[PDB]
Amino acid sequence: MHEYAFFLGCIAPNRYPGCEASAIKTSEKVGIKLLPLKGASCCPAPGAFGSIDLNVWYAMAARNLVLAEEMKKDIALICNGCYKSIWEVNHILKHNDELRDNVNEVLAEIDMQFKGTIDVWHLAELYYDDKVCGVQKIKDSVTTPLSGAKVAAHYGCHLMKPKKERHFGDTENPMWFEELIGALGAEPIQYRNKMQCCGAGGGVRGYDIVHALDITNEKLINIQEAGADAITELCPFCQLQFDRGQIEIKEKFGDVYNIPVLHYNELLGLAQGMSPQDLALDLHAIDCTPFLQKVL
Amino acid sequence: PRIGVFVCHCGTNIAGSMSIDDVVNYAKTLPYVAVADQYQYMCSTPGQKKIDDAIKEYNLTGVVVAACSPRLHEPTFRTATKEGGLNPFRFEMANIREQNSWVHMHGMWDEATQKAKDQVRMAVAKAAKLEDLVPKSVPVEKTAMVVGGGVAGMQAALDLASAGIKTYLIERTPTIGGRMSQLDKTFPTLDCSQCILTPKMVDVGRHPNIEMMTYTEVEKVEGYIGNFDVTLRKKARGVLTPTEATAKGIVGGGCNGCGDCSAVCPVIKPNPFEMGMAPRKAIYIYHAQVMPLIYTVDFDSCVKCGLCVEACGDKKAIDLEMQDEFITVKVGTAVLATGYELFPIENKREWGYKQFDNVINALEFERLICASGPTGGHLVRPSDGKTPMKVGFVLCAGSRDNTGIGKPYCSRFCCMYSLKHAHQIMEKIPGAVAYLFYMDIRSFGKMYEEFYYRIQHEGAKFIRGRVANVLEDKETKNLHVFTEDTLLGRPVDVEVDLLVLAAAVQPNEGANELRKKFGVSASQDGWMLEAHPKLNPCGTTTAGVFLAGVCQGPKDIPDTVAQAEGAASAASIPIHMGEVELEPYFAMCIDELCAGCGMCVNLCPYSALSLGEKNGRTVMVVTEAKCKGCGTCGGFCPGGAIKMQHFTTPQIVAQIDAFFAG
Amino acid sequence: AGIKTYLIERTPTIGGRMSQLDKTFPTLDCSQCILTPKMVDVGRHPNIEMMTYTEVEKVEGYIGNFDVTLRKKARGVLTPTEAT
Amino acid sequence: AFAVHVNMERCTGCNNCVVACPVNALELNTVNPSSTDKIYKVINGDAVILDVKHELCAGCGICVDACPYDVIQLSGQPP
Amino acid sequence: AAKGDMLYAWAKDAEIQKKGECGGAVTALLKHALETKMVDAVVAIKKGKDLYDAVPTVITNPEDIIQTAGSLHCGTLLIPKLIKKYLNGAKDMKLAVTCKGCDAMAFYELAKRNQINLDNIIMIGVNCGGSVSPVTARKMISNKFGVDPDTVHKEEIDKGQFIIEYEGGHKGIKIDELEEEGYGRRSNCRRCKMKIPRQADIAAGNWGVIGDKAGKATFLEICSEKGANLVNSAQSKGALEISPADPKGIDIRAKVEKAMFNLGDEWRHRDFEGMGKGKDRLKLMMSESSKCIKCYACVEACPICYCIECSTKKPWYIAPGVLPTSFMFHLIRFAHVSDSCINCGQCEELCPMEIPNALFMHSQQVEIEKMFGHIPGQDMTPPIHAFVEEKAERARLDATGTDSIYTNIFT
Amino acid sequence: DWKPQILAIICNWCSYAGADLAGGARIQYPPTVRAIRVMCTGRVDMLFILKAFVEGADGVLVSGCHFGDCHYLEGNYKAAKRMFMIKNLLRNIGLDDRRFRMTFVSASEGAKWGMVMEDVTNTIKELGPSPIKEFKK
């Protein structure tokens, strides 16, 4: 049973707690142990806080990293934006000496040092790796087939891009996340421009809601045209956009889709037999009941 | 010994960094120095006259010139030393310009003067110990080899043969011609490529002075400028030419190219000439215009069914049990003309080359548009066989790219061939529109700008924007090309029926292996390197090897042919003379110091060293022709039994001692 | 290659435009430094009849024999050979 | 020489994959046993395949047909 | 009997078996080879005078090898360089040579450099626990043992102590105690670790012979097919008796060999740190080497020095007449020999000026060895500079993790 | 009163070309190193280096072609092995082994030649005068 510190940023615990609950339960069912991070905070959200000040972005991400450093554990994440912040600041401060120095003399005011000893992983990346739980182990753990459901994957942008800074391979047409959805028994479908941004990154969600919603609506149109019955995602930002933004699209525009948006951990819980009440699917703006009728 | 020291000013390039007067007075007070003197331009005719007059007047044993680099002006001053009654090799330079002045210009003058005095002292110390050498002259075999049967190889072979030298033309493939045989029409004159080349292919095939050896490779090369012992692998063609059949005893003949064999062969495989678009049997020719019309057998795919031999009948040209024969050929010079291949553009995933059906590259487009290709010359969509009406051309596909996937250089001809293809589609399909997504149209050659003007006049759309990514419509299989029109200032989404990628070119497959066999180095770009990038673009640093064609860097057919004839001329220079002088830097074994340990023998890359019998004692023997003067053996030998002719241990140690003299 | 050659130049010196160039793209070498070796070779070659400051008045003939008439413009100064 | 994979998560230790494998049954149940190596052995309650390098299986399907709650997947394609 | 067998061997002839230090098997094998005409001569050590004088001898009469029987512990000489100089390198005649570990290593060094013919030479190797200089042994016996040295009959290093047999009885003193007091084995013998010459054709010793044969049997290890043939021929013609060795004997032979390795390591340590570190080692080396009078005895005695004319004799390296000679003289030997020094000590012990040539050279050799991984004198592996390899050179440049040869090379 | 005496032995085909290119490009560096110019670095015997160091070179530099880019196919592998062994000898005779280094400079690296010159000068200046010059006496 591999053990990881569970970073747990802002949106999953405070808006979609079923995501974190299913994360812990399903990760324990497969051979992974997710340990609470002691006093972790907002990973300085890369858009809304990196746009303001890169130095304080570095300092806060480094503080989050040195918490798990003192814990002597590897970070595990469930958010693409949190992955950007944590993993990328870890990578930058493992190689840039003057930035290490600057962050360290900022952190020395709170009796705290960064040395760069741990690694950062996304939970879906762990589920895909073969040393850690693999696709076959996921298939083994699945107990409810979830058959006869068309499911559209949204990769997001901060997990895989830029490919010159990550290690997940092709960004033009990846299929790895489609294999994790196929392990659950749901057939993943392909839609036009599947690698498009959801529109919520960089603080655009806050600065220009209509612009962000138009970017989201382009995706929703493509997904409905494909014929999806739900949208899996690996990011609480993207889930919030696809969930709230459907309501804001219904009100600001006149478009109705009613497409449930679920984190992959929530689908994994559904596959492994967790209850909809135990997943808190009532906390989503868009009702999941048609999808539950199909897969149950 | 009596040494003369002549210090050049180089026209203030040296006098503006040091005190030439002080250097000269120090040279006068140096030991062994008979005369020290200075001049503004020692490389000029008054400078050589000054050297010669000094030699005659002062009875000089050796000459030291404190001037520019030896790599610049050894030949000049060696010839000046010869003219004057000395050996050319009683001369030594002291580089006090490119290693003293130009690097110690600013704010440091007496330091540069002291450095110059030190360099002059070391040069005088070496020259007081130099002694006479005579360059070795070696005979040159009157044959030549041309590796590559493309336009550059064929032109070089024809040029050498018509100059009268017997020539070998080695081609790995069963036919000569190269890429130009695959081209359909040629920019900017729009001539048919096969029509203009078939004449020259016939000349090569008929020339009595050319030994055309197709379907053959170069296993190994040893030797030097004089004699290159080149071993060739005659791959098992499986079919006998009439000459070989008569030699083996079949009077009725060999292969006449009737085609019955391929009419009955049941195996069907892709044709590499048609870039895989077209079928060909196990026994086959690339196209109907191949020069040796001899019908290779593909032994990796033949099932030995024996139908081909029954079809061939009394001609008995097919020998299904043939094996790779090896031949050793002695040649005087060699010309390398290996050409190029298209860079693998499936690595650029944003342009769905392998993943979308209707995305092709420019050689596949050229085969599709040729009238002798898999189609009847009709461009049709690979996805469904329908005629396109909008065609996009992605220029710079994998080129001028610093991301590590593509090539950082320009492929030279891809702007021109994309213009040609746009013209061809707009004239062959009525109402079809060509869109060129370009980033610097490069029509630099003769009539190229006029060709560009004419294409725009016929109505190709030029969108200045590098393509960002390509999406495939799920149903119509049409391709959505996304970029920005940089001049218009807006993003664009052009939906085309067919997308053509003007991919970069790279050195052919196996070219690095062949150039390592011949001893040629590579450029920064990965192409074969030339002797001097400006004034010697054909010859290489290894003597007797010359470059021709795209193998030295991408070029159009005109530039390729000019380069090929230049290489043929350079390869003919030593063959016509019949003599060639080697540089007397060889290793010479001092036998009554050699102990016969044999340990130096394995330190020679060229196998110039061996153990032999002289006066009962087993001593080492140098093949002075094979030695190249590196000095590895002579730097090894513990007993000092190997002497390096112009860089002897006493000379080098005298230089060290003079440096530490104060 | 061994053929006797005439080199006609209208100007009093060989070299051309590259003699006027200061440095050369794409390698940034000094033009005269790289060319002077070759100018010296031309000036010393026994098989080259270097005729500077000379023009071609008329040409008649064909592939076999070209009867080329040259105008040796009045240089005003004698080379050592011509002086002797 | 195929590859068998046992889903440890639902293996009950029933040992009917060990008893039914005809390569395991070679040692004690053959006249003059040829090879005495064994694919499965139930260590700590789950079936462990000692045949790590996929040299002894013969794709018989006696073990896949034997496990009561299907848990053994047989791969007929090269690993 | 076959290339790896470990045997007990003694001579059939009772007189040969008495005069052998152990069972006379080296003298029975040499006699058999000579008289059955495997070899045309035999190069062994005999006493020329008192047992402190060891004289090499080429023997062709099979009647003279009984005089060669017995081991002289004061024989500090080296045989293979004499075969190259005065026997034409054994290029035309077969020889059978009795040799210690240093003499086997020297054979292999000279055969690498093509100076002898190991196809012709047969090497009967003896175990060696150390040799004493004859004059130092005399002073040892006069002072520490309190005996007149001319009284001694035999003397041997057995069980790590120096047993002498004189008229009156026998005595014994620990060799470690003697070596602390300033006597004992030679310095290079204290540092030596080539205790059982497994590179020779036969290895004979008194280690591992236990029980009823503790002083009348030689432990033989057959180390090659040539030695197997010699032994089988001798046993069949009946000049030598063979019984398979005792497993307990083999075990304690291994243990004594291993303990000798550890002792050699300890002496290597204490000597090499005794030389100093940094500029102190340069002042030690330079001040010692300023004594050299250029007798060239070190060059003429070194097995690795095979050059017709030494570079130390070339006027552009060493000024011919300047007697307080340069440090270049010894730098030229460090450069040429230190990569393959077999620690024979001849350079140290033949120096009129008492310069620690062997100590300096071995101190450099041990870590040229742990750098390049080349053990001198074991087999036909070419010297490190006579065989350079592309892949290995890449490997050492990449291991430095650097773009040049400047640092991150040593710990 | 003291100026470092650094001696360089540079091959003709890459290090001499690189130094010439640096000069042509007008890259300045201090005037402390004087070069010898042999054909290949395979020519460099160990006794050359040791002779330099015993005459009193405060530093010695040997510059050649990159691995795989020797004009004579493999002559700098021999030089590299020789210089590794020279580094070992100088460390064990107690002279400071950082007085010696071997750099691989290509024909086009004039800037790198200038940087090598600067770094060699700096290192020898830190190290100080060689001890042989006073140990001789």
Ligand SMILES: Cc1cc2nc3c(=O)[nH]c(=O)nc-3n(C[C@H](O)[C@H](O)[C@H](O)COP(=O)(O)OP(=O)(O)OC[C@H]3O[C@@H](n4cnc5c(N)ncnc54)[C@H](O)[C@@H]3O)c2cc1C
């Ligand atoms: C799509 C496209 C269109 C083009 N259109 C034009 C055009 O319209 N006009 C124009 O002027 N140029 C055009 N070019 C460029 C033109 O093709 C080249 O200038 C020309 O072909 C160079 O010929 P080459 O002989 O140097 O090389 P190649 O034609 O490639 O010939 C090399 C030959 O050597 C052989 N060979 C390779 N390696 C070995 C080996 N190891 N041993 C033996 N033989 C070997 C190959 O099989 C081949 O036969 C075009 C290029 C492309 C890609």
Ligand SMILES: Cc1cc2nc3c(=O)[nH]c(=O)nc-3n(C[C@H](O)[C@H](O)[C@H](O)COP(=O)(O)OP(=O)(O)OC[C@H]3O[C@@H](n4cnc5c(N)ncnc54)[C@H](O)[C@@H]3O)c2cc1C
């Ligand atoms: C500003 C500039 C910079 C350049 N820089 C570079 C550079 O960095 N690198 C590079 O590679 N190229 C460069 N070039 C191009 C380069 O100059 C040419 O490629 C090259 O000079 C061509 O030489 P040529 O012998 O053909 O012509 P020219 O050099 O012009 O030589 C022609 C010669 O013929 C003589 N002549 C003319 N008419 C007659 C006649 N009727 N009878 C007798 N003699 C006659 C002329 O006097 C002259 O000596 C540059 C060009 C320019 C204009």
Ligand SMILES: Cc1cc2nc3c(=O)[nH]c(=O)nc-3n(C[C@H](O)[C@H](O)[C@H](O)COP(=O)(O)OP(=O)(O)OC[C@H]3O[C@@H](n4cnc5c(N)ncnc54)[C@H](O)[C@@H]3O)c2cc1C
């Ligand atoms: C200096 C020395 C130290 C030794 N130390 C040990 C030890 O610690 N442990 C051990 O087990 N064995 C040691 N031996 C070897 C020991 O003597 C063997 O047990 C013995 O050689 C067995 O042979 P043998 O009695 O059967 O034949 P022997 O009749 O003894 O034959 C001995 C042979 O050795 C030759 N010989 C004598 N002196 C020398 C010499 N100085 N150099 C070379 N050859 C010589 C003789 O000529 C003869 O051919 C040592 C030998 C020597 C010479």
Ligand code: SF4
């Ligand atoms: S010889 Fe060199 S330094 Fe002297 S003038 Fe000519 S180019 Fe200048």
Ligand code: SF4
């Ligand atoms: S049938 Fe025979 S002669 Fe005719 S093409 Fe085939 S091989 Fe040549």
Ligand code: SF4
């Ligand atoms: S043997 Fe059969 S498969 Fe081969 S070429 Fe002849 S007909 Fe075709």
Ligand code: SF4
């Ligand atoms: S020739 Fe034109 S299309 Fe080809 S790489 Fe250069 S700029 Fe791009």
Ligand code: SF4
């Ligand atoms: S020249 Fe030197 S290395 Fe070569 S065989 Fe003679 S002694 Fe040996």
Ligand code: SF4
């Ligand atoms: S110098 Fe020596 S090693 Fe180099 S090519 Fe000549 S003989 Fe061979």
Ligand code: SF4
């Ligand atoms: S398939 Fe057959 S041989 Fe293979 S493990 Fe199962 S029962 Fe055994």
Ligand code: SF4
């Ligand atoms: S038969 Fe099935 S449940 Fe029983 S041990 Fe084997 S794999 Fe497990």
Ligand code: SF4
């Ligand atoms: S050096 Fe070693 S093998 Fe030679 S005598 Fe001394 S201890 Fe014995």
Ligand code: SF4
């Ligand atoms: S033996 Fe001693 S004194 Fe004689 S040359 Fe060698 S070091 Fe000098």
Ligand code: SF4
């Ligand atoms: S240097 Fe001295 S100790 Fe080393 S092998 Fe030579 S003689 Fe023996």
Ligand code: SF4
């Ligand atoms: S020191 Fe060197 S040169 Fe002198 S003999 Fe020994 S190996 Fe030969």
Ligand code: FES
């Ligand atoms: S040519 Fe420079 S190192 Fe060999």
